[PDB]
Design a protein around this ligand. Structure first.
Ligand SMILES: Nc1ncnc2c1ncn2[C@@H]1O[C@H](COP(=O)(O)OP(=O)(O)O)[C@@H](O)[C@H]1O
Lengths: 24, 107, 106
């Protein structure tokens, strides 16, 4: 379960980046 | 070398003989002849007793006397975290830390 | 030359008990005990703190917290003596004697 939440943290970081690229 | 008594810890003047006779029996000889004989190296020592006797000091001293890597350590019940799976991932991490080195540098 | 930071754990027995005795599925008590023990004692060094705790029974205290170097010092607060009883009463009645509301009989 720990690895799952770590992967989801990575996913949320990626989502922020991509929404930080699409807006501009 | 047995300045241990005067190294900074009193202890006893009997343990060292057994400890290093076993250690020499294990690791002194070249790897190839040991393999041919097919004998297993000694891996594991048990220490116990009342606190404040210098057990940690004895551990550091024995680790230093033997030509080995800087000693790595772990807590007593921190291994039992409030999680199911940590007791697997962390322990595997500790063992894989040296397993990677063994794979890289080989036997 | 930092100074002093003093933290007080009222009813310390509330959160500190035997680590392995508890059979509850969740191990919150054990985790908090581990965290506090690491903070007070561990590789990291502290020299500007003073922790004091108060309990109403030393029975429910895990020995790990009593280990020397963490809470080595201990103290009991017994019963007052007769002289202390007199001083206590004087303190408890100074106001009343201040306003002249105590009969000389007493
Ligand atoms: N013969 C000795 N000479 C000097 N110091 C000692 C000796 N024996 C014990 N000590 C001191 O007592 C402590 C031993 O603690 P120890 O019993 O190893 O704790 P634990 O039981 O948690 O490992 C050390 O801090 C060490 O400095």
């Amino acid at each position: 379960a720990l690895s799952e939440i770590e992967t989801r943290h990575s996913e949320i970081i990626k989502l922020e980046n991509s929404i930080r690229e699409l807006h501009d | 070398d047995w300045n241990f008594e005067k190294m900074g810890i009193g202890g006893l003047d009997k343990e060292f003989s057994d400890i290093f006779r076993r250690a020499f029996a294990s690791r002194v000889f070249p790897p190839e002849i040991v393999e041919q004989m097919g004998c297993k190296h000694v891996k594991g020592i048990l220490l116990y007793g009342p606190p404040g006797c210098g057990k940690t000091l004895l551990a550091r001293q024995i680790g230093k006397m033997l030509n080995a890597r800087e000693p790595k350590v772990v807590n007593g019940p921190e291994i039992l975290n409030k999680y199911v799976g940590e007791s697997e991932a962390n322990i595997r991490k500790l063992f894989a830390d040296a397993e990677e080195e063994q794979r890289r540098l080989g036997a | 030359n930092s100074g002093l930071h003093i933290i007080i754990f009222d009813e310390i027995d509330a959160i500190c008990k035997q680590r392995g005795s508890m059979a509850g599925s969740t191990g919150v008590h054990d985790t908090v005990v581990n965290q506090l023990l690491s903070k007070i004692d561990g590789v990291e060094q502290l020299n500007n703190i003073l922790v004091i705790g108060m309990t109403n029974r030393p029975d429910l205290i895990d020995e790990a917290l009593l280990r020397p170097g963490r809470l080595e010092v201990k103290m009991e607060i017994g019963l007052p003596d007769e002289k202390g009883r007199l001083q206590i009463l004087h303190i408890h009645t100074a106001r009343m004697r201040g306003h002249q509301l105590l009969s000389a009989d007493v």
